[PDB]
Amino acid sequence: LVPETLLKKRKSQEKARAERAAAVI
Amino acid sequence: PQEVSDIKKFIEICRRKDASSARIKKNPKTQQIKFKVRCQRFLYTLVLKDSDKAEKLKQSLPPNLQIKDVPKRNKR
Amino acid sequence: GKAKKKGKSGAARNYMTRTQAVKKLQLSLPDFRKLCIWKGIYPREPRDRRKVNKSATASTTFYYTKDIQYLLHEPLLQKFREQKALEKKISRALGRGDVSNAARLERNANLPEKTGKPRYTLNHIIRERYPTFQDALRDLDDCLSMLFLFANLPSTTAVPAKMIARCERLCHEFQHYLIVTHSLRKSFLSIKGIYYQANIQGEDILWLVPYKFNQRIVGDVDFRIMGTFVEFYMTLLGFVNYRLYTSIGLKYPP
Amino acid sequence: LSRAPKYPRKSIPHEPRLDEHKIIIHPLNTEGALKKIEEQNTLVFIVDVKAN
Amino acid sequence: TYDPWAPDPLKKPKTLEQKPISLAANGKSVPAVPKPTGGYSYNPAFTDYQQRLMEESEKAIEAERKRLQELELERQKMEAAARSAAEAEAAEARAEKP
Amino acid sequence: QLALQKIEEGDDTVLRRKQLGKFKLPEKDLELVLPDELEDSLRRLKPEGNLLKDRYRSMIVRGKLEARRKIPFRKQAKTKLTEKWTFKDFRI
Amino acid sequence: MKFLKTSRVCLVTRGRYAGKKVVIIQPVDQGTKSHPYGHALVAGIERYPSKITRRMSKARIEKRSKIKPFIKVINYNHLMPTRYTLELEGLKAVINADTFKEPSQREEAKKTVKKVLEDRYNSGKNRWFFTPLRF
Amino acid sequence: PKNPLLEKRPRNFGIGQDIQPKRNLSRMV
RNA sequence: UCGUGCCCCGUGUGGCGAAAGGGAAGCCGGUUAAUAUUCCGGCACCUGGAUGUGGGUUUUGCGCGGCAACGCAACUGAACGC
Fold first, then answer.
1. What's the gap in Å between the CA of E49 and the closest CA on chain F?
2. Which of A13, C166, A15 has the alpha carbon at shortest distance from F50?
3. Fewest C-beta in 10 Å: which of E52, E59, F87, G130?
């Protein structure tokens, strides 16, 4: 469990949730 | 009025904050001694055989609780 | 004397739920939330919510009965009813084809998209909420953070572009007062924004300004009630700016 | 809608009808009252019939 | 113009004077703008940045350990359910003066 | 012993266990520049977080309002469609 | 022939657990000294798991799938035998006569009965045993 | 995969079986 | 949040009418010229409200025992019903 990759992964899911929230007569 | 048969529970009742006063009734014909404590709801009575250590229970009762011996005549 | 009945006193009289408060004030939910934010009516928590309402859950919102009683006498209720009746008159005029009458009645609506100001006037509310200018200066942190944030947002139906321009104008006036009085003390460039600390009349005022970039409005925030906060805060900042300019002897508005 | 009158129906609010000077009239100087003073720490007063 | 600070209830209720509820764990009032620390700077000090990296790293490690533990517990739960279902199918197969 | 047991600014980072509204507030998003992402200038700075979300969370935490979720669709009134009498009585 | 055997599902008709469903762990047809009559050692459900809907969250499903068990010595006259059978290998000799003489053994036996019954319930089989009788 | 603990409980709305569902009684108001 | 609405339910209709019907809860002793289950002393009770302490329950989340009749100081329980 590399903490740098874990923090990168957490930032990735937080970011993805951020743009997901911001997005005949 | 309630009767207490446990010395420990009687000591806790006498150490309760609502214990206004206490009195000792001596019955020599029956040869018994009664400790009565006045609390808010109930008067609690502990009945003991009359004895020296039964008198000595006064030193185990709290000092701030006033203790009065019951007189022979309840004068109005 | 006569025997009391259960549930007629205590917490059941002290509290009411949001549904009971809305039915008591005879308002809609947006108007009730707007009035609660403007008047400072805060949610409360009973010790036992079953004693207040047997159908209450963990998400049930409670308020003070005396707070709702105070809200009963607020003059903005008549303003809400007058604006609703005026909108009905405008709809009647547009449906009958009286364009001049519709325009004349719409001039009485005082729309934010036309004036740049809030639809309802909160001047009497400002003095009630802040008994002293010191209290106003102490709430200026939240006021300045909210208004400096909203000065860089795109136009929405809740917050129109003219009202955003008024936010920017008020922030610029406050900055000009700080410049001419040299009240600014500290600044800090963080990863979230620029923090500013000033000292106005012995009160430390710290607020955060975003970097000039595109700001993201996410769905996890309640943007309309944020806009109600914005309206209250610009109403406060106008009077704060007027008092500061008059105290240092300058003409307001500049 | 609640009432929002254009004029008050009563111009002056009335004074409290039963204040303390009307509640307490005079004490009782009878021998039973004077006995109660020394025996029960109790005073006896003649008061208004409407006072509780 | 207009300047503040210079039967209807003209007196506010004391219920309004009561303080609002704080969601902080200690129950104290949270400031509107909390004072930032040196670790939140864009070009922070080495000690502050390394410290903040240490708390975030250990939080990431403990969170990953917890999620792996609960995933393993769930996997064991479904394995136990599958074993019980297989046993039930096998049982139905075998059944078919004082 | 009982007396001893009785004898023995807030922060946004840790919150109480009880909720105020429809849900308990989640943990804040990570506001930290990872060591690969550090830049040497203010121009290349990557701003983190969302200040509107920060103000909303500050409002909820200080307790001026409770946390509620967005309702994207509201339930419509149950109605039945029927033809008008004039269009029923039309004949040609 | 004899039907009050091991894995027989019965309904309790008297006592604190009246209306509950039990599985027979051990029949004692001849009786013992303490219980001089035909009886049985049974394990059963005291609190049934709650109903699960399609829109429930997984935490709520896990909370509502809980089972509170009990173990009991019960007379045959206080049992209603059912045609259903619950075969569980984990309940083989989970309780005996000496189990009820010590509180800790009863707790351990109830824990074993609990884990086996929740495994069988999460399997999806024998739904009649895990639904409560309505009377 | 769907949860095996989910069950269907259909209601028979015949005469004398179940409580009748709430229908549109607008013709008889 | 199409923010200025939606959902659920049916049972009707208010009041008066008993110091002998129904009904929450006070006893003993003493005391006055004349009142007393009302006053005084002692010892209690009922109803309603708020909120603590002790104790209880809970990591097998909402007690345990008895074959049973049931017991034990506690031992969650809204709508709708019996």
1. 9
2. A15
3. F87
Q: How far in angstroms lies nucleotide I7's C1' from the CA of residue C4?
A: 35
Q: Which residues make beta-bridge pairs with C203?
A: C200
| Nucleotides on strand I lying under 7 Å from protein C-beta | 1-9, 24-25, 30, 32-34, 39-40, 42-54, 60-71, 78-79
Amino acid identity of residue G59, one-letter, is A
- Resolution in Å, one decimal place: 2.6
Q: Which amino acid is at E5?
A: W
Name the nearest CA neighbour of G14 among G39, G33, G34: G39
- Residue of chain F nearest C151, judged by CA positions: F52
I59 C1' – E78 CA distance, angstroms?
22
Six token digits for residue C62: 């409670």
Distance C9 CA to I47 C1' (A): 13
G with H: how many residue pairs have Cβ under 8 Å apart?
16
| H or E element that contains C207 | strand C203-209
* Cis amide prior to E34 (ω within 30 degrees): no
Separation between Cα atoms, residue C132 and residue C113, nearest integer Å? 32
Tell me the C-alpha distance between D31 and E34, whole Å.
Answer: 76
Q: What angle do CA G1, G4, G10 make, to 5 degrees?
A: 135
Largest CA distance in chain E: 110
Chain A residues with CB under 8 Å of C223 CB are none
Residue G47: CA count within 13 A, CB half-sphere: 9
- What is the residue type of C8? K
Tokens 């109403």 found at: C235
CB contact under 8 A, F10 and E40: no
Nearest-10 crossing angle of helices C76-96, C29-39: 140
Q: Which of C153, C214, C216 to mutate to test the interface with A (most CBs of A within 10 A)?
A: C216
First to last CA, chain H: 46
Chain E contact for C208 (CB, 8 A cutoff):
yes
The span from the CA of C245 to the CA of C174, in Å, is: 9
Structure tokens at C206: 């710290």
Collect all residues of chain H within an 8 Å Cβ-Cβ radius of residue G121: 5
Distance CA C197, CA D47 (A): 68
Is residue C189 helix, strand or coil? Answer: strand
> Residue B54: what residue type?
A
